[PDB]
Symmetry: C2
Subunit: 148 residues, 2 copies
């Protein structure tokens, strides 16, 4: 659903804002899972997430990973999927972000909600083998007032 | 479909590269039509393109617009569409582009084929009303050799 935070926000800061708005608890474990999911090449299984994060989180169980994933799914920031003939569920961080457009004439700035930059990081990794670290984006255009 | 021209190219630059590789002529009018199609915010008819471009092209007829659109359709950069209760053809630009990824450690550059930046432009227009002119995109990451 289309909305604004009156500023650009990356996927990570976006989720945290949305959760705070909904008065949802945000632990360090939850932040770590969110950050891992965002930065992830693949669509990791819960076990993958767990195995990669456990060493830095002593009180973490697999149950903790699944429980957090359920909340992120229910709040619409990750999606669950299965592939054919495979019993494991795979998780995909698909949370949106907010990016700026600048008027090339009057320099006025507006923001918009984006879900496509994620698919670019994936297309890049698939074709090139790079582990994608960041894809910083800003759009340029002509604001409605300058179109008139 | 996935391929490289060994350089980043935007949607416009990409179409010209593709046409060149097939030794297809590229006139000023063909360039103007490619650009128009890329920057259109609604699916234009041939007459819309014609009426908008003709003042800069005394050479141009409606035929020239249709002929150029046909070439662009045949080369995979535009598609035709029909709507209910209208006999007129409308056109959609569907060409991809090529963007770089830069390795943060060693600086090696590779490129990949992209179709999503155009969707970003569309979302920006729909939500904000701005006419999008450009979205410079460069990806950064860790190249296979460095990892
Ligand atoms: Ni948001
Ligand atoms: Ni190409
Ligand atoms: Zn302006
Ligand atoms: Zn490298």
């Amino acid at each position: 659903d289309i909305h604004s935070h009156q500023q650009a926000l990356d996927a990570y800061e976006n989720v945290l804002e949305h959760l705070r708005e909904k008065h949802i608890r945000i632990t360090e474990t939850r932040k770590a899972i969110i950050s891992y999911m965002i930065q992830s090449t693949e669509h990791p299984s819960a076990d993958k997430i767990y195995r990669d994060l456990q060493p830095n989180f002593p009180n973490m169980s697999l149950a903790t990973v699944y429980n957090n994933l359920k909340v992120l799914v229910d709040e619409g920031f990750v999606s669950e999927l299965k592939i054919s003939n495979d019993l494991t569920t795979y998780y995909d961080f698909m949370g949106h972000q907010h990016v700026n457009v600048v008027c090339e004439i009057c320099g006025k700035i507006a923001d918009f909600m984006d879900v496509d930059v994620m698919d670019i990081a994936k297309e890049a990794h698939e074709q090139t083998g790079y582990k994608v670290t960041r894809i910083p984006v800003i759009a340029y255009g002509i604001c409605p007032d300058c179109q008139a």
